[PDB]
């Protein structure tokens, strides 16, 4: 890998600089290099990894949706034939997106998850695994679509099981996992009732545990609780 010659600490330093510069592709490449050093990631480093790839794939997903909408409109009755270009370019973006997802999934499988023994790290990585299978599912149309969906579900479910046993209901990783798994249910699994039930129960159980928190922990937990409420408002 192109980052093989760079010190771990320098890759992390540069990831932080890339974030400040809003250079998320560079940030992701630096963090990939850091992961590939083979040492476990600290909490801060896990967050750098996730922020980098979230921003890269987020941009690809937004572009894919624009292109998919244009393509769908082209296939409506009365739309003039404009040739293969819209499909080709949507495919191009799609393939690049799938590549990024495969890269992230590859880092998780080799070997972040297997070395992650603490609840906070293991849940964080399993949530990421669910998220990147969910992004693959968003664009899947073939023989493997059901298996991709099930891979996301399985990763999220393992993360939920650990989170419920090992973390308080206000833990931001637990909350963010539940938020995202709820979206999986609504948008991917055609299970809006499950999505709504999960968001509601997660919100209410967090509410009941806020009294245990410092002001700073309260801020962190309530931010994500508000996202749960925002989704519930969208869905009800």
């Amino acid at each position: 890998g192109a980052m093989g010659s760079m010190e771990r600490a320098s890759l992390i330093q540069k990831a932080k600089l890339a974030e400040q510069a809003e250079r998320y592709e560079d940030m992701a490449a630096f963090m990939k290099g850091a992961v590939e050093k083979g040492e476990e990631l600290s909490c801060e480093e896990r967050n750098l990894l996730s922020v980098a790839y979230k921003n890269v794939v987020g941009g690809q997903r937004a572009a894919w949706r624009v292109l998919s909408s244009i393509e769908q409109k082209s296939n409506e009755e009365g739309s003039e034939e404009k040739g293969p270009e819209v499909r080709e370019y949507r495919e191009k973006v799609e393939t690049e997106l799938q590549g990024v997802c495969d890269t992230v999934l590859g880092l998780l499988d080799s070997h972040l998850i297997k070395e992650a023994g603490d609840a906070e790290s293991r849940v964080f990585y399993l949530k990421m695994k669910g998220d990147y299978y969910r992004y693959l599912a968003e664009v899947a149309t073939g023989d493997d679509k059901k298996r991709i969906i099930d891979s996301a579900r399985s990763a999220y479910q393992e993360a939920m099981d650990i989170s419920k046993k090992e973390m308080p209901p206000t833990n931001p990783i637990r909350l963010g996992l539940a938020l995202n798994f709820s979206v999986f249910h609504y948008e991917i699994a055609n299970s809006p009732e499950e999505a709504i039930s999960l968001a509601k129960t997660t919100f209410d159980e967090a509410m009941a545990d806020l009294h245990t928190l410092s002001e700073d922990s309260y801020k962190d937990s309530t931010l994500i609780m508000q996202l749960l409420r925002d989704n519930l408002t969208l869905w009800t």
Binding site: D131, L179, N180, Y186, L227, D230, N231, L234
Partner: peptide, 5 residues
């Protein structure tokens, strides 16, 4: 589009 983190 719904919120995720």
């Amino acid at each position: 589009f719904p919120a995720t983190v």
